[PDB]
Amino acid sequence: SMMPQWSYMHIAGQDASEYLSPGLVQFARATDTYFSLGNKFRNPTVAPTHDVTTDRSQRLTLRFVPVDREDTAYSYKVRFTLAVGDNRVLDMAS
Amino acid sequence: VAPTHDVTTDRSQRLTLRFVPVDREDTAYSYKVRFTLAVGDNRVLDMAS
Amino acid sequence: TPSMMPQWSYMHIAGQDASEYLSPGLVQFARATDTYFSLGNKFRNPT
Amino acid sequence: TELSYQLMLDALGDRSRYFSMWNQAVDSYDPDVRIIENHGVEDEL
Amino acid sequence: INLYANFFPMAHNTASTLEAMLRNDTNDQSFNDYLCAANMLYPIPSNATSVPISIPSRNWAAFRGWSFTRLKTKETPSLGSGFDPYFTYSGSVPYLDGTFYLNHTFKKVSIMFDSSVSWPGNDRLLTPNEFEIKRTVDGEGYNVAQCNMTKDWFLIQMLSHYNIGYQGFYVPESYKDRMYSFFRNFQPMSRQVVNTTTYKEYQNVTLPFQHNNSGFVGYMGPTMREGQAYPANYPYPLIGQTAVPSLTQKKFLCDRTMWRIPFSSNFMSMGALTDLGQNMLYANSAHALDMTFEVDPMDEPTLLYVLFEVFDVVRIHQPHRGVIEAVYLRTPFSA
Amino acid sequence: QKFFAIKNLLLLPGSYTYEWNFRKDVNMILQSSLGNDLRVDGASVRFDSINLYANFFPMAHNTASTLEAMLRNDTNDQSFNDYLCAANMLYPIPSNA
Amino acid sequence: TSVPISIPSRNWAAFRGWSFTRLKTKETPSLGSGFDPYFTYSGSVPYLDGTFYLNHTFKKVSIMFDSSVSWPGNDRLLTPNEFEIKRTVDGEGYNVAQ
C-alpha cells in the first residue's frame, strides 16, 4: 500500500492503544468487562536489537580445569582461576 | 452497578441465531456446505462463538 | 576508605531503597534491562 | 548455609518438583504413612 | 450440519457506533496465528541419519528461529486430496494432535549460512559449529544433568522457552511450564547392566531361556503354571554383596514438545521479533541456508518435521458494508 | 553455589582465584532409607575430576563497559542476604531431660 | 520439483515481461563454445529451434519482488500469492474447458 509492510500488518509499528481511532480505544477500554475486544488487535513486540548484543566473539559456557588440588582421605579441595573477560560480567548464580 | 441503558437491544433480536445450509455437496470422502451467514444490519458478530 | 556511615545504613539494614542509594545510571540500566540478566536480586531494600 | 538453601529453594520458587541437575528433590513422607488414617479394609464379599 | 452463532443483544444505537468505527480503515482488525510456522516434511530412509537440507537464497527479514522434531511416516497424511490410501494408522497423529515422542533420537544439528558461516557461531556456544543435543558416550565432561543432554543445550532449550539460563538455572516457574513446553518433560533416566567385557561370565542368556519364577508363572507365553523351581538366571544381580560389575546408560525423554532454536543473537527471547531478525544483513539481502540434522537410526522409515517460525499476521478491512478485504503475510517463506 | 555472599555475586572483569573443599565422608554425602552407617560397611566415594562452568551474558560491550565502570563506585555495590540468616547453635539435652 | 530462482536487486527500467518453458538437459547443449563433449543428442534442440514440448508440466508460478511482495499483488488472481497453471490434484471449480 502506502505503508511499510510491518507497520501495516503490525509487526513493528505502534501498539493497539496508539494506532486505533480514539473512539475505538475509548470504547474498548470501556467494553472490556463484558464485550472485550482485546484479542482482535495486535500489539507488535520488538526485541531491542542494539545495545544488548555483540558481533564480536563471546562465550556462553566456560570450562575451567582445576589449577591445583589436594586429595585427602576425606576432602578433595580444588583451586581454580576464575577469569572473566573484558566487558564480560559473570553472575555466580550461573 | 451495571450500565443503565445504551447497551441492550430493546426489540426482538435473537441470541444463538441458527443457520442451515443453502448449498450442499457430498463426495465419497468429503462433505461440503455453505451458509448465507447474514449478520444483519445494526449488529456485530464475533466468530469465536 | 574504611568508611564511617552509621553501620545501620551503610549496610542499609534500615537505610534507603535501591532507588536512592544507587546512582541514577545504574537504576536505569537495571530497570530497563530487567527481563534479561536481572539485577534486582543483587542489591537490597531495607524494609 | 546448607539449610538456607533448603529454605530459599522454597519461598522464591516451588518445591514439589524436581530439577535433577542441582539434585533438587524435596524429602517427603507420604502423608498416609506417618498418620495412619486406618479407615478400614473395605471388604464385604 | 448447521452453523449456530450467538450474536450479542447489543443495543443498536451503540452498534452503529461500533460498526462504523470498525469499518474505517485505521482501526481494522488483525489476527496472527499463534504457532507461526512454515512447517516442512523431510523424509528419512528406513535406517539412516544426517538428513541434510538446503534452501535457495532468500530473505530472513523477520525469522524467529527453528522448531524441529521427528515423526514416523505412518502417522502423517499427504495433506492433499483428502483421502490418502497409504494413511492407515489412526493413533494420535503427532503431526496434528501435537503429541511428539521422538526427541531422544536427535544427535546433533548444524546450521550453515551461504554455505560458509555457522549460525549460532561467533563462538557463542560450546563446540562452536553444531548445536549439539545429546552426546552419547563421548563425554570429556559435557553431558548436563544426570542424563545425556549437553550442557549447552539445556541452555538453548531452557533459555529459549522459559527465558532462564544465563543468570541462574532455576526450576522453571509455573505459569511458564505449560504442558507443551520443556521442563514439564525432560525426564532424565538412567540404569545399570552387566558390562560384558568385565564381569567374566556375561553369558547373554536370550529371553527364551531365562528360567526365573521357575514356573510358578507362565512358560514363554501368558499361559498357565508350568514350573519346576530353581533359583534362576534373572539379571545379573547388580545391587548386592556379590553384584557383578556394570556400565551405565542414560536417556532423556522430551515427549510432548519440540526443540526450539531461536534466531536471536543471544538465545534468550526479548520480543516476538528477535533481536537479530531485523539485523540488516538478514533483511537487506538474499542468502542461502544449508543445515544438517543427525538422528540415530530407527527402523520403519521415519519422517522429519521442521518449523521455520515466521510472522503470519493478517489484517482485515471492510468499508463497503457487506464486504471483507483480507490481507495475508509470511515474512520468511511468503510463498 | 549456596553461599549468600557468592550465591548471586555479580563478578566484574578481572582474574579471581576460586577454590573450595569437597567432602568424601560417606555418611555426610549419601542418604539412606534404612538408617545404617554406610561408613561401617563399604560404599566409598571417589572423585575422578572436578570442573567449573559459568555462562556469561553476551551483553553488548557498549553497555558492558558502562555497567562495569558504574559498578566500581562506592555507592553502586552489591550487598547480599541469605533467605534465613541466624546463629544456629545446638544445646545438648541429657536423656529423659 | 519446485525449482527456485533469485535475481539480486536490479533496476527494471524498461522490463517488458517474462516467458518460460521447460527443457531436457540431455537435449540442450551447454552454450558458450562449440563441441562440448557432454552433449550427445542429435535430434531437434528445443533450446534454439523453438521446438518446445514441455509446457504442460508447469503447475505453480510465484513472482515476488524483494521476497516479500507478490507482483500482481492486490487481488488480481483467484489465488493472490501465485499464478496457477495445472489445478488437477483437486478442484473447487477453477479449471478451463475440459
Next chain:
Amino acid sequence: FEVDPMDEPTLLYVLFEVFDVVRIHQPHRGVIEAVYLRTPFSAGNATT
C-alpha cells in the same frame, strides 16, 4: 515454480524479456560504428 517430476534431468528456461536495441552510424565512409543496449539486463560499461 513447481513442476511435475521427470525421470531425466531437466533445466528450467526463463526468458526475461528485455529491450535489446542497436544503433548504427557511418560517418567516415568505411567505418561501421554502433552502440548497443539492453535495458533491464545489459552488459553495458561505465563512462570513461
Next chain:
Amino acid sequence: APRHGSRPFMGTWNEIGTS
C-alpha cells in the same frame, strides 16, 4: 455540534469505570 457522545456504559462504581 450541540453535544458530546463520550462513552460511559461500563458497569459503574461511582462516576467511574474504564481501563
Next chain:
Amino acid sequence: PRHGSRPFMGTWNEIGTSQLNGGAFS
C-alpha cells in the same frame, strides 16, 4: 453471590524505605 468490598485508592508501604513481607528472610 456478591462481593463489592472497599478500601481501594491503592496502598501505602511508603518510601524513604520499602515494602513488608520481606522479600527474602525467614
Next chain:
Amino acid sequence: SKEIPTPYMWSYQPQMGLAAGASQDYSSRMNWLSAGPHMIGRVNGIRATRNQILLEQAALTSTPRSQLNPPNWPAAQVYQENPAPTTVLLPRDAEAEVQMTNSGAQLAGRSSFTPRQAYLTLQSSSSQPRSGGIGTLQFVEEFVPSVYFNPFSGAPGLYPDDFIPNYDAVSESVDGYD
C-alpha cells in the same frame, strides 16, 4: 576520479519502511566499445543529462534531510492517512424506545413513535500518528536515484555510508552473523 558518474540506484525493503542497500546502475547501461568518438561523445552527455535530471528531480521531490536513509523517519515527514470524519446516523430514539417498551406492551418486532434522530459524527484518523517507515509511494519520492559525483574519495567517515547494505546507522557499524 570520474565525474559523469552512473547514478547509484536505491533498493527497497517492503518490510521496515526505510530503504535498503544501494548500488551503481547494475544493468541499464549502453555498450559503446563498438562505437567511435562520434557517439562515445554523445553517450557521454546523454548520461550527463541523465545525471542532471536526477539532480533536479531529487532537489524537487525529496524533502531535504541529513542522512540518506534515516533509521526512523520522524512523525511529520511520513505521508499520513487523514480519513474523513465518519458519520453514523444513529438509527433510533433511545429515550422513545425505552419509554414505550416500559409503557404499553410494545415489543417492537425512521421511527413512528417519535420523529427524533441524530448523527454521531466521530473521528476517524488515529490517536498518535505513524512514525517509522515510509510506503512505496514515498520511497519513489524520497530516495530518488542518487548521483555520486565522485567516488569514495575521502577519509573513512565522510563516505556515503548509507549505501553499503550491511549498515546499521543506529550504531554506525556493519552488522554480522552472516
Next chain:
Amino acid sequence: PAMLAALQSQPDWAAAMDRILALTTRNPEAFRQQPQANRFSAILEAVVPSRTNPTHEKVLAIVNALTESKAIRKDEAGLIYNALLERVARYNSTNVQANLDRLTTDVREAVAQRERFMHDTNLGSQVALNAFLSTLPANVPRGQEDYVSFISALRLLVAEVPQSEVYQSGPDYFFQTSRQGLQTVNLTQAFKNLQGMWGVRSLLTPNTRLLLLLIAPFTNSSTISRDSYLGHLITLYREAIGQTQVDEQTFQEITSVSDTGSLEATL
C-alpha cells in the same frame, strides 16, 4: 561530561539538614513520620557528616570526557577506567588528587574551542581551504581578477555552511564536500580548469559546473558583468536555483492536492 558523571554516580548535606530540621516547603511533615530507625540514621549524618572518597567520581568524570571527544572508544572505557584508577591509586596524593580536580573542572569548561571547532568548522574547512588557497597559482591570473571574488565566495561558503563542508586533502588534489553524506563531492584541484575562463566573454567539465552550482547561491553582484561564461553561468545557476525552489514548492503543492504527473510539467 561531568553531570553525566554526577548522573552516573553519587546517588548532599544541606538537603538532609533541611529535611530533618523540617525546613522544606512542600511537605515539612516528612521526616518526622518515618520509623524511628531512619530518623536515627539521618540525624547522625547532619550532626557529624561522614567523609567521602571522590577519586572514582571525577576519574569517571574524565573518561566520560575522552570517549565523547574521541579518544578511548566507547567499548574500551572498562580498561581505560581501571588503568586510570590504578595509576591514580598509586601515585595518588594531594598532588594528583588535585591535579585531577583541575582537569575535570576545566575539560568540561574548556569545551568552547570544541564548540568553535563545530561553529566555524575551523578544523577542516578554513584551515584546509586557507591551505589550499595557498597551493593555488599566484593570485594574479592572466585574463581577469574576478578570480578573487570567486575564491572569496568559496571561503564564505565554507564558513557559513557548518553542516559538514569538510575539505579533505585526499592526496594531491584537495576536494570540497557539500555534506557528510558527500553526494556532491567536487574536486577542488580540478578547477585549475577554471584558470582558463577566468576572464572571457563547453570546456567546463561538470566538476567545474558542480562547483559553480555549489557556490552560486552565495554570489550576488560579485563574480560580475558579462565576464563570460563564469559570469553568466553563475547568474544562470542562481536563476535555476530560484526556479528550483519555485518548482519544489509547486510540486509539493500539486502532490498535496492529490504517477509521474507533476514531474513532467515541472521538469
